[model samples]
Target chain A: KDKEFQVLFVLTILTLISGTIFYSTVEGLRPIDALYFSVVTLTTVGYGDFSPQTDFGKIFTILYIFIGIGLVFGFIHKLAVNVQLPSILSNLVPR
Target chain B: KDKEFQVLFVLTILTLISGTIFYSTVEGLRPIDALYFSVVTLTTVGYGDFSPQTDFGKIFTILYIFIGIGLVFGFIHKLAVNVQLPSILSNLVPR
Candidate 1:
């Protein structure tokens, strides 16, 4: 479990960095905005406040969502499972 | 495992419906839009196109994200685990 956690942590960071660089370069967003956009999209929190303007950016976002959502949420789910949130909140998840 | 799936399935549906109704009534979004927003938010694809404008609605959305993100993603995670996504995709998640 610990190994799994560490692997996921690294993957999550790598994914975010990759996303940040991609968005900043392709979408021409500031570094902070790019990172914010990456986290928002990966978390499935689309927020629509900032989206890809170019066609390439749009397509990339679609693919990004397909892969990133699962990766980010999978990591989050594992963390929640390992850490054990409060009973009321944790009960919402299946053991 | 099947029991867990069913429970999560039911919870997901109930949460979506409840969110739809709440947004429709409180945020004054059309029913379809309400449903769309609910799905978008729960899925963590917020799209910011239709966020809560009212103070109460914003607060509700915050609370909604806290609980709903976990529930929705938990369901998706379980589905992926049960369905066994393609190896390239499934590899991103820890078993």
Candidate 2:
């Protein structure tokens, strides 16, 4: 469990950085905006406030969604399980 | 694990329904639009396309975010874990 989480965490970070870099370069967005866009996109929130304009940029968006969401959402799922488990167990334990 | 996943799943659906109902009433949006808004908001996309006009609607948005994201994202997280685990394990096993 420990090792798996560490890998997922690193993968999420790598996707974040790569996405930020890609968006910043292709879309001419500031680093902050790029990072924000990356998070929004990865989460599938896709507010459409900041989107890629060029063809390559748009194409990359699709690929990024698949890889990033899988890992990131997966990462979030594991974290949530860890968080909710304690309370769930406590509830099951009758006084 | 199975029971916990089921609980998270139900919570997510409940949030979706409640959000849809609330937004439809408060915002006067069509059912489809309200449902779309619910999904977009809960996902934290915040598209700014369809936002609450009234104060009550706006305040409700905050509370919705906390609960909706926790459960929905938690649900997604569980699904993601189940998805990624198979491939990750398959890689570790000898061909």
Candidate 3:
């Protein structure tokens, strides 16, 4: 409960921060726009609307991809590990 | 308990809204597509299939980055402070 939750929380924080900050500042878009760009970039959706044009922006993004590629899998694994099977099963069955 | 729960919920809503709204508008794409795109970028996937093409888009993004990145950490910190330790441990441990 403690450790697993912490890890998941970190994943959420990392993801949220990266999206809201990097995309908006590096790309020079709104919070909404930055967020959307983050989603498309991470998931490989690539809608062709917003992308990084600055030198540092490009470098930061490239590094992000390399580090992010593996972090996601680990985070998902932690989430799965923390899942409560009985609670879900009981809720499904009802009284 | 009340304050903690509310804070957590707000974080969730913020993250969700930021993701859904920003990506959808910045890219001129479908809801689902925007969502997917947002996830990618936030996660730092940067597949490069899609990107911004306008000046305003770039500037707005920069501002959002400065604000969002910090908000994420603060929001996450609040969430950790409000976690229910006993409830989780009991649920996981065998009776």
Q: Ignoring the other chain, what TM-score does chain B have in each prediction? A: 0.83, 0.81, 0.54
lDDT string for model 1 (B17-80, tens) is 8998999999998776776677767776768777899999999999988889889878777765
Q: For model 3, what is the error of residue A20's alpha carbon versus the real structure, in angstroms, after optimal superposition?
A: 2.4
RMSD (Cα, Å) for all candidates, in order, is 9.6, 9.7, 13.7
Model 3, B1-95: lDDT tens digits are: 66646754664457657756765687576777766554454433546564445545445444333333333444455556656555576789897
The interface root-mean-square deviation of each model, in the order shown, is 4.6, 5.7, 9.5
Q: Compared with the true structure, what per-residue lDDT tens digits does model 1 show for residues A1-95?
A: 77777777887898899889999999899999999989988886676878766657755765566456766877898788866666558789998
Shift of residue A64 alpha carbon in model 1, Å: 0.5
Query: How high is the lDDT of residue B45 in model 1?
Result: 79
Which lDDT tens digits does candidate 3 get at residues A1-95? 75866876587557857866987876787887776566445534455566789898888778876666466545434443344323434565756
lDDT of 2 by residue, B15-76 (tens): 78898898889889888898899988887767779866665775576446534566776678
User: Candidate 2 overall Cα lDDT vs. reference?
Assistant: 0.75
At residue A12, candidate 2 shows an lDDT of 80
Q: Please tell me how candidate 1 rates in CAPRI terms.
A: acceptable
TM-score of 1: 0.51
Clashing pairs in 2: A77-B77
Flag regions of model 1 displaced more than 4 Å. Answer: A84-95, B1-44, B48-95
**What is the CAPRI rating of model 3's predicted complex?**
incorrect
Strongest candidate by DockQ: 1
